[PDB]
Structure formats: C-alpha cells, structure tokens
Amino acid sequence: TNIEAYRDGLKLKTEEDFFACDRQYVCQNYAPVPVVISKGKGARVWDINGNEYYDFLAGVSSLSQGHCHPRVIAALCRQAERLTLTLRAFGNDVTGPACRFMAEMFGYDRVLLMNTGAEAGESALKIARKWAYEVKEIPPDSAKVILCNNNYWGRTITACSSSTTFDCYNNFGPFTPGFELIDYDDVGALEEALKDPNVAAFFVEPIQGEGGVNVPKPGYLKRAHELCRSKNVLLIVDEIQTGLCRTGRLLAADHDEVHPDILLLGKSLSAGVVPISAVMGRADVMDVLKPGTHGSTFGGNPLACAVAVEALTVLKDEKLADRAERLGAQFRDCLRRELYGKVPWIKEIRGRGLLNAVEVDSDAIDPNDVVMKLKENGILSKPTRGRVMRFIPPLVITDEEHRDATTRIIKSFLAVEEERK
C-alpha cells in the first residue's frame, strides 16, 4: 500500500534513520523513548529489527485488550467494507444500536459519542454549564467548575485553562474563566468550594493518571459524591484512563459504589484502534444539548461504533477486570517485597489493578537510567512527571508473560541500584 511503498523508497534502514525522519518532519512536542515499533500483538511489541518487548504503557490504558486484538480488527474490517461515515446529519444502522449498547452496559439514559478524551471533557463541561444556566438557573456566565490540582484531561485551551501543570498552560493564555482548583484527595477543600452556589460541577479522576497514579484515601469519591449531591452539583468522573477494567472493576468509581452524574470514557473504548470517546448522563442533564448546540464531524461514526461494541464485549468475555485485579495485586506485592529497603531511592509503589507506578527520588537517581535499563531488559515504559515510573500493560497479558515481565522489572531496578553503588 502507499505507506509501505513510500517508506521503502525513503531507504530507512536503521532505527537512527527513523529517529532522523521524525526529528525533521514531525512537530517536536514529544521526547519519545528511542525505539521504533513496527508490530504489536497482545502484550508484546516488536521493533524494526525484530527485537521483542513487553508494552508497559499500552496507550496509557488505551490498549487494555492488547495490540491488534483479532476480534476488534475483524469488527473494524467488516464495518469498514460497508460504511464508515455518514455524519449525524443522516441516520445509519449502527450509531443508535451502539449507543443503546453503551447505555445499557453503564446504566445511563443518553450517550454522546465524540472522538478524543479532550473532546469528551469539553463536552461534559459544556453540558454542565448549560444545565447550570437552564435547570439550576444560576446567573448568566457565572457557572463554576471545581477541578483538582495536577488533573489532566487534555490539551485544548480550556483544558490548559484548568491545569496546574506549568508546561500545560504556560504561554497559551488568555485562559477560559470559571474554574476553582482544589487539592486532590481532600474532602474538606471540596466541601469548602461547594459552598459557592454558582458551582455547576466537580470534575475528578478516581485515580489521577498523568498526575502520577495518585490513589486517593478510602472513601474519597463516595464522600465527594454525597457532598455534591447535597448541593445539586454534578459529579463528572473522568474514567478515560481508569475505566474499562484497568483498576480491577468495570469503572474505577465502582470501588466506591459511585455512579457518576456524568461519565467520561475513551482510550480502551476502542481497544486503541480508532479514536472514540463517550459522555454519558441522565436525560434531564444530557438533553440540554439541543439540536445544533453541539456537534462533531466524526463523533459517532459507524466504524468507530462497530469497533467500540466489540472492544467492550472483549472486556467482559475475557474477564479482564478479574485479571487486572489478580495480576496487579501480585505485581505490587512482588515489587514491594523485592525492592522496598533494597532500593532506597524508591519512594512509593502504588496503584490499583494494573494501573501501577513506582515513584523514585530524582535527586538520588536519574530516572531516565531506570527507563533505559527497563528497555535493555525488554520492558517499554514512559514515566510521568519525570520521576513517576508507570507500569500499565495490556490486561490480556498472560500469567506467564506477567511473571516474566515482573522479573525483568525488578531486575532492572536492582541493576540501576547496583550501578549507583
């Protein structure tokens, strides 16, 4: 095909030829790990030279079903031969059924399909504001949304406007008003912010992802929902990264028996095959989005819908929540046993399910040394905030793969410590 033929013509032999090509022609807004992946299957990827690795980033939990899951790829190919795009201006025979499927699986009245996690967040903020103005009857332009320090929900200007991460906002203003930032995992701070009747919503992650896999204290989300409910404030829960079995439950919010007022999904909603995200809520909230007040060219396209229904079904059929729960407990147990004390520059091993992190003291060690040693030992990962090592494999990783990978990971932390000595 044309990508293959064009690439051959470039005579890109070596990994360096590819790194040079990316440096010259790709906008340079990433610092990637120096690997050139050519193939993925399940928990494994291979580089252009045939070297094999375990993928411990998995799209930051977009590939929970594994790379190239055969059922999902089969669903993609079948629908792609039939119909990929109509626009929501025309009906089709896929979008409604796919939304009913989701509505039933997650227990919501209405489903809005968008393409990216950022777009889901923007949509939820629009819905929460317009509901606050039209149903709560707060004063025009006065709506406030509470978010948490170190949150991450995307890269739009409005997302940058509600970030506390310097590189995410700096020099991208002037900023969208109407946000109140409070500490994460702080019910007292939330209760205080909820005294303002102009608050429309509290927008929160059940575990902060990009912020460092910050797992809150027992009861946090349960407590937050009760506080919000008492003030008629919507709880918007971002499950784009934590959702869909990654933490050992269908939604991370299930750990607290919380049914979000507005749910966001994305990432593994498509098994990492095509971009599709969802916003779900009750009718009297979602129906504020009247005809013409919101839209998206590709949102709810039939190809993505067909893929999402298959991706969702795989999670259930393969009992991936149970896998995540069991393997992740084993992961944290092994790492704590073998690394705590032995490695003094480990600050904390934390997580839920197969969303795990190892926080290192970046004054005591170069975190990039840990990254490169992991890669030498067959493990691909990328930290967040420099020092938070992340371990987010596909949930389909087998028992034997996970044991092998765990051994390689422990061996790598020990090899970096040995080098420090």
Ligand X SMILES: Cc1ncc(COP(=O)(O)O)c(CNc2cccc(C(=O)O)c2)c1O
Binding-site entries for pyridoxal 5'-phosphate: 117-118, 241, 297
Whether the ω angle into residue 174 lies within 30 degrees of 0, i.e. cis, is yes
The correct pick among 11, 50, 137, 171 for binding a second copy (CB under 8 A) is 171
The CB-of-3 to ligand X minimum distance in angstroms stands at 22
Residue 197 main-chain phi, psi, to 5 deg: -70, -5
The CB-of-278 to ligand X minimum distance in angstroms stands at 12
Residue nearest to ligand X (CB): 117
CB 108, CB 263: distance < 8 Å: yes
Give whichever of 118 and 193 is closer to ligand X, judged by the CB atom: 118
Among a second copy, ligand X, none, residue 79 binds (CB under 5-8 Å by kind):
a second copy
DSSP-derived letter for residue 208 is B
Among a second copy, ligand X, none, residue 214 binds (CB under 5-8 Å by kind):
none
C-alpha–C-alpha distance, residues 360 and 387, integer Å: 5
In the range 312-341, which residues lie near a second copy by CB under 8 A?
312-313
Note whether 39 binds a second copy by CB under 8 A: yes
The correct pick among 54, 106, 118, 256 for binding a second copy (CB under 8 A) is 118
Note whether 6 binds a second copy by CB under 8 A: yes
Give whichever of 244 and 405 is closer to ligand X, judged by the CB atom: 244
> What CA–CA distances, in Å, run from 13 to 10, 89, 188?
9, 46, 58
The CB-of-382 to ligand X minimum distance in angstroms stands at 8
The CB-of-385 to a second copy minimum distance in angstroms stands at 10
The CB-of-128 to a second copy minimum distance in angstroms stands at 10
Q: Find the Cα–Cα–Cα–Cα dihedral 306, 312, 317, 319, rounded to 10°.
A: 160
Spell out the residues 6+ positions from residue 214 whose beta carbon is closer than 8 angstroms to its own: 150, 184, 185, 207, 208, 350
The CB-of-62 to ligand X minimum distance in angstroms stands at 8
Note whether 245 binds a second copy by CB under 8 A: no
In the range 173-212, which residues lie near a second copy by CB under 8 A?
173-178
Q: At what angle do helices 399-420 and 367-376 cross, to 10 degrees?
A: 130
The CB density around residue 129, as the number of other CB atoms within 10 Å, is: 20
3 state SS of 305: helix
- Smallest CA-to-CA distance from 37 within 61, 57, 23 is with 57
Give whichever of 232 and 297 is closer to ligand X, judged by the CB atom: 297
Among a second copy, ligand X, none, residue 209 binds (CB under 5-8 Å by kind):
ligand X
